[PDB]
Amino acid sequence: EKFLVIAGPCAIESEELLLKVGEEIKRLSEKFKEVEFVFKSSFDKANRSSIHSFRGHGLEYGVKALRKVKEEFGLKITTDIHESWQAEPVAEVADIIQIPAFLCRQTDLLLAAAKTGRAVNVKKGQFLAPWDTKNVVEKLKFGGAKEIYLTERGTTFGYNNLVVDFRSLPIMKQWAKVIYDATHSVQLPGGLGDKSGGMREFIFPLIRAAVAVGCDGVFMETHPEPEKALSDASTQLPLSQLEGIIEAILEIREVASKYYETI
Amino acid sequence: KFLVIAGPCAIESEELLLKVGEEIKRLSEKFKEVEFVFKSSFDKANRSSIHSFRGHGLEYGVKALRKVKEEFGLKITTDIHESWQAEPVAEVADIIQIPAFLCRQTDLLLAAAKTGRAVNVKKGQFLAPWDTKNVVEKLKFGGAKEIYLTERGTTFGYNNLVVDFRSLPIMKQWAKVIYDATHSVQLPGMREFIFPLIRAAVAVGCDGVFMETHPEPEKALSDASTQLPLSQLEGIIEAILEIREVASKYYETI
Amino acid sequence: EKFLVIAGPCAIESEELLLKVGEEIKRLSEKFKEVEFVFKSSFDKANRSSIHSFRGHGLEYGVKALRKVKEEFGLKITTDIHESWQAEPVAEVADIIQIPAFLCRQTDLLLAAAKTGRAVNVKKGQFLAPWDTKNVVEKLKFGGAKEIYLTERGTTFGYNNLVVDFRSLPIMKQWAKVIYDATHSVQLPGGLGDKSGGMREFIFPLIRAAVAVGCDGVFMETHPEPEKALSDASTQLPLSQLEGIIEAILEIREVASKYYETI
Amino acid sequence: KFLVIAGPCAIESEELLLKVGEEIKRLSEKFKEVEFVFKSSFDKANRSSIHSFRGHGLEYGVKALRKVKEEFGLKITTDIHESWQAEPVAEVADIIQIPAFLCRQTDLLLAAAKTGRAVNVKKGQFLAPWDTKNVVEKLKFGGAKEIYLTERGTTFGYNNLVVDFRSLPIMKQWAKVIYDATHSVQLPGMREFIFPLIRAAVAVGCDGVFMETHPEPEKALSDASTQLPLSQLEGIIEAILEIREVASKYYETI
Ligand SMILES: O=C[C@H](O)[C@H](O)COP(=O)(O)O
Ligand SMILES: O=C[C@H](O)[C@H](O)COP(=O)(O)O
Structure with a gap:
């Protein structure tokens, strides 16, 4: 099956930032033809730790900027919603509607996304056990979703720390396609006080571990200059490093693929 | 004065709310030093299963809570799940409750704060005690003046929660602290x-306790495994008041 | 039943330190007659994080110092063993043989302690679930132990942190008397790099929570000047604060006692 | 070269060790680029139950391991539980193993280091990756020169272990790292x-893998639920060698 790579800047800092990243992602999509790329960027960071942190320029602006990326580069689009009413307008541009981790159990949000007819990707909550995602998928199927993804992004491990339990990949594979979030899984929740931390190293x-275990795609936030990012400055991957990372996971995926267990 | 938030988990019917409300009113008259607040959700918006009980809607719920307040003169509290719900709920709710999974949703907090009502935020199972400082700041920024933080357990491995009592004194630095005695023992995805x-909570020191109670927990449509039998409420309240009376002498300052 | 208070300096820094603490503990035992005091101090810190940290002055010296305390103040004694061969010599002075947390599953150590005829107190390992202590008690009973205690001292919660799950008290009470370790439960394992940290506040x-929930005794390390201690300098209670703490827990225990559940 | 430590969990009989040893010798000849080390415990000194299988004693065990080394020319490794055992075990053991629960027992580490043999310390389930730096220092202080640290899971709630692969690169800063593929999936107090x-371990990067294997795990007297069927060992070794070959290109320096 075609491997999915969901990548883009964490937040829509500006339409300019999007086109800059989109251009590179477009170049890679032409090189890595065996990969299905989906451009990601949040029109709103609705769950920042601090009231003073950057949120975004609004739904309207965001959808417009994302539409420009799709129009200019012919790339699929994905962005996350935070309340039910956002599903409809977002569905006009998003090929994949993303459900935030903290909201993976909010029934109406899932239902709103499902009835749009678009694919739905749910970030597994940091509080959820792998087997608890079966009911999340059930809700989505009940709501009409035909293409569902579950994203591993770490689990609460003590305070201000997350651990990735790779056993989650084969477990969740039982009921949906699985995506590994390479950038949020290394973040340190509230690690900086007013903001969250992260360990880029x-x-x-x-991500090498994820593809060796086996998944259907990877999610990576990337920014031309991470240190200047307005969100997740500590975990976004420098855009120049994206190509090498993708080549590496495709190579590891290939050699490991013959050993992937059948669910 | 010491706060006691109690009531059936979900508004299964205003009939149920009236039965539970009568007992809470009674206790209310017996324990004058305690401020009682009637709680019940008009919607269980985060059930694990799509086939589980959610409720009868916001309108029916607000109406039923209206009945309780009018008939018994008891303050009210219920939780909201999306920003638009804040205003209509504030009509009857003296305290607007913010769900644990939603404790970081800025717009929900601001929406609640804007109503002018008191706001009680359930501490997310993914949150550290010190991480709640930012939560309080959001509410203050939104105009909230009466702010509560509720301890309801922290993720401890899979399908289990642990109560780190160190959280009470930490959260007390920036808000009044409530201990959720029934959700803290639930196994995500007990009663004993x-x-x-709850005895530990008052021994350590808190500003109030949260307890879901139901005439027949066995038949409850929500949290059946952890809801306290109505008939046992009086005894537990008396017990925590006695422990608090003695222990309060040792509560640390700030 | 008579409430147990196990207290003393973490390590036997010197026979002088012991007599200084012993004197105060003796004074309190005369005041709090409803309490059974047991003087505690390790002749060896055999599990320090760093090879450069203080360990002790040897078994011989330690037993001699502890014997002096028992002889001079008529106090019961408890100390921990680290290898099977230490059970016999230690049993000559120790009324209660303590089993270290990391070693709570070492069958031969438990058996060695049990056959001495002395009481045995096992620190619950940071890796052990409350219900897993049933087999620990079974081993001890199998080995001849007639008086057994299980001590709650925290559980691994993420890295370098411990949490106290008070549900452990009523669970462990099903098969043994329960003791709450008020000082090790707040320590931060390896929190200082070459040493462990702790939050005295x-x-x-x-400890108030422990007695409200209900236990059969408490364990507290105390030192005249904690800041100068050679071990657990961050968690040992200043000796001057001991009396007030004990009075407080007896008061809370009394008022809460009528509500203690029957196992 | 890449290290592969394999063998039956417990020395149920030298007969068992010989059967498993023959297969390991065979693989040894097929994978010349891999350094095989035969492992088996002469005593399960930390079983949960007093009624569970422990072993036939140190003497019988050392004799059986002697047989394996002499008959197949395979290096040997076994764990010790008390200081006095280091010397007699070092007679046959090329690598002395330190149990996870005992990774902080200074005298056991020093005793092992004094023998002059290599020392492999199982990382305690209570230990953080960076906490192992001190463990290595103790061994170096004791004269150890060949030191290994083994990842075998970390306490994650009750009766469960999680493997935090971030540990591999961290521990690599001060020692060779081994990944215990069978104990990392056990539930304290699986096989799938x-x-x-193990594929993840080599993709991330490690210096070797530890795998308990048994002809009929179902009948094993120890770790029956997690021991790898002998017949599946070859396939897994080939697989990890292939993944390592490709992934090694990306292993980070130091
Ligand atoms: O991904 C979710 C959050 O927005 C995340 O923790 C980053 O936000 P913060 O830096 O405001 O905590
Ligand atoms: O209680 C056990 C230890 O000795 C504890 O972690 C204190 O030792 P350290 O400061 O050497 O880590």
């Missing part, structure tokens, strides 16, 4:  | 530990 |  | 995850 090794 | 842990 | 509130 | 996680 672990992004690559853990 | 409700009383022991 | 939580010792009192958590 | 052994292969997936």
Whole structure:
């Protein structure tokens, strides 16, 4: 099956930022033809730790910027929703509607996404056990979703820390396609006080682990200059490093693929 | 004064709310030093299963809670799940409750704060005690003046929650602290530990306790495994008041 | 039943330190006659994080110092053993043989302690679930132990942190008398790099919780000047604060006692 | 070269050790680029139950391991539980193993280091990756020169272990790292995850893998639920060598 790579800047800092990242993602989609790329960027960071942190320029602006990316580069689009009313307008541009981790159990949000006819990707809550995602998928199927993804993004491990239990990949595979979030899984929740931290040095090794275990795609936030990012400045991957990372996981996926267990 | 938030988990019917409300009113008259607040959700918006009981809607719920307040003169509290619900709920709710999974949703907090009502935020199972400082700041920014933080357990491995009592004194630095005695013992995805842990909460020191109670928990449509039998409420309240009376002498300052 | 208070300096820094603490503990035993005091101090810190940290002055010296305390103040004694061969010599002075947390599953150590005829107190391992202590008690009974205690001292919660799950008290009570370790439960394992950390501000509130829930005794390390201690300098209670703490828990225990559940 | 430590969990009989040893010798000849080390415990000193299988004693065990080394020319490794055992075990053991629960027992580490043999310390389930730096220092202080640290899971709630693969690169800063593929999936107080996680270990990067194997795990007297069927060992070794070959290109320096 075609491997999915969901990538883009964490937040829609500006339409300009999007086109800059989109251009590179488009270049890679032409090179890695065996990969299905989906451009990701949040029109709103509705769950920042601090009231003073950057949120975004609004739904309207965001959808417009994302539409420009799709129009200019012919790339599929994905963005996350935070309340039920956002599903409809977002569905006009998003090929995949993303459900935030903290909201993976909010029935109406899932239902709103499902009835749009678009694919739905649910970030597994940091509080959820792998087997608890079966009911999440059930809700989505009940709501009409035909293409469902479950994203591993770490689990609460003590305070301000997340651990990735790779046993989750084969477990969740029982009921949906699985995506590994390489950038949020290394973040340190509320690790900086008013903001969350992260350990960039672990992004690559853990993504290698994900493809060796086996998944249907990877999710990576990337920014031309992470240090200047307005969100997840500590975990976004420098855009120049994206190509090498993707080549690496495709290579590891290929050699490991013959050993992937049948669910 | 010490806060006691009690009531049936879900508004299964205003009939149920009236039966539970009568007992709470009674206790209310017996324990004058305690401020009682009637709680019940008009919607269980986060059930694990799509086939589980959610409720009868916001309108029916607000109406039923209206009945309780008017008929018994008891303050009211219920939780909201999306921003638009804040205003209509604030019509009857003296305290707007923010769900644990939603404790970081900025717009929900701001929406609640804007109503002018008191706001009680359930501490997310993924949150550290010190991470709640930012939660309080959001509410203050939104105009909230009466802010509560509720301890309801922290993720401890899979399908289990642990109560780290160190959280009470930490959260007390920036808000009044409430201990949720019934959800803290639930196994995500029990009853025998409700009383022991509530005794610990008052021994450590908190500003109030949250307890879901139902005439027949066995038949409850929500949290059947952890809702306290109505008939046992009086005894537990008396017990925690006695422990608090003695222990309060040692509560640390700030 | 008579409430147990196990207290003393973490390590036997010197026979002088012991007599200084013993004197105060003796004074309190005369005041709190409803309490059974047991003087505690390790002749060896055999599991320090760093090879450079203080361990002790040897078994011989330690037993001699502990014997002096028992002889001079008529106090019961408890100390921990680390290898099977230490059970016999230690049993000559120790009324209660303590089994370290990391070693709570070492069959031969438990058996060695049990056959001495002395009481045995096992620190619950940071890796053990409350219900897993049933087999620990079974081993001890199998080995001849007639008086057994299980001590709650925290559970691994993420890295370098411990949490106290008070549900452990009523669970362990099903098969043994339960003791709450007020000082090790707030320590931060390896929190200082070459040594462990601790948060003294939580010792009192958590001990209040322990007696409200209900236990058969408490364990507290105390030192005339904690800041100068050679071990657990961050968690040992200042000796001057001991009396007030004990009075407080007896008061809370009394008022809460009528509500203690029957096992 | 890449290390592969394999063998039956417990020395149920030297007969068993010989059967497993023959297969390991065979693989040894087929995978010349891999350094095989035969492992088996002469005593399960930390079983949960007093009624569970422990072993036939140190003497019988050392004799059986002697047989394996002499008959197949395979290096040997076994664990010790008390200081006095280091010397006699070092007679046959090329690598002395330190149990996870005992990774902080200074005298056991020093005793092992004094023998002059290599020392492999199982990382305690209560230990953080960076906490192992001190463990290595103790061994170096004791004269140890060949030191290994083994990842075998970390306490994650009750009766469960999680493998935090971030540990591999962290521990690599001060010692060679081994990944225990069979104990990492055990539930304290399963099998389907052994292969997936071992693939991850080599994709991330480690200096070797530890795998308990038995002709008929179902009948094993120890770790029956997690011991790998002998017949599946070859396939898994070939698989991890292939993944390592490709992934090694990306292993981070130090
Ligand atoms: O991904 C979710 C959050 O927005 C995340 O923790 C980053 O936000 P913060 O830096 O405001 O905590
Ligand atoms: O209680 C056990 C230890 O000795 C504890 O962690 C304190 O030792 P450290 O400061 O050497 O880690």
